[PDB]
Design a protein around this ligand. Structure first.
Ligand SMILES: [Zn+2]
Ligand SMILES: [Zn+2]
Ligand SMILES: [Zn+2]
Lengths: 108, 109, 109
């Protein structure tokens, strides 16, 4: 929980129902997964940005004489039991994992 | 079927009188060009945005949830016979060259 | 704070030897130039796309969920001293002047 150029929020979500697979196709996330005749909930640990601009100028801490910046969220891939309505399988879906600052050089 | 994100208008300009050079000074563009014992008339081909908001939200196709946008004219430098009050002199001057889309991030997510 | 839809790169070219003119014909650009007892080299300020797909999706900021897009270079015309093998004449040649984002619709869901 270190002071950063971008403010984030993390939480455990055990009810995700909708998602984007690795191929970028939307899919539905099965609520109960059954392993070896044992059924479990699918959990994800997600981290979102609090705002795209923690501060007026963009990300906090930036040398704003020379850059433009903003906070955005990034992804990791986790296997999940999903369905796209055609075939039910395990796919890798995106899960937001961080809020990083992207930069752009100020145009002079 | 391909749209452009911004719209522009081209135009052959023979009636320019004033300009901003490369150093950033206001300068006047002379009308005819004399040099090597001959007289021409200065023409510049220019292109610029028809409008700033082709669509309501700004540029076309933009993801409006995340972005704010609008069209703007971009410059190129061109050589031209000019005079600051002082003396005639070729200078590179700045002219409208294109119309492009420019993003601005909406403050939240 | 402004971000751009397409990334361009600008430079100065001092060794152009050939180009396509306003009529679309392949011509020769004179390297040097003597006008009113002086000698100079022809310089042209050019702008191009750093890339066609700045971002994965194509242009930056687009709504790829519904659109296809890419970056592309557009041209201008500029007066230059040239030669069509025989004739030494000023002519407007074609130059890269910018990087714009082009659109294509997509039949979605
Ligand atoms: Zn203008
Ligand atoms: Zn202008
Ligand atoms: Zn080109």
């Amino acid at each position: 929980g270190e002071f950063s150029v971008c403010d984030s929020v993390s939480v455990w979500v055990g009810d995700k129902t909708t998602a984007t697979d690795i191929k970028g196709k939307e899919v539905t996330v099965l609520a109960e997964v059954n392993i070896n005749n044992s059924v479990f909930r699918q959990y994800f640990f997600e981290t979102k940005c609090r705002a795209s601009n923690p501060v007026e100028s963009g990300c906090r801490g930036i040398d704003s004489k020379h850059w433009n910046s903003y906070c955005t969220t990034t992804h990791t891939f986790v296997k999940a039991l999903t369905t796209d309505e055609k075939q039910a399988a395990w796919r890798f879906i995106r899960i937001d994992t961080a809020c990083v600052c992207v930069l752009s050089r100020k145009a002079t």
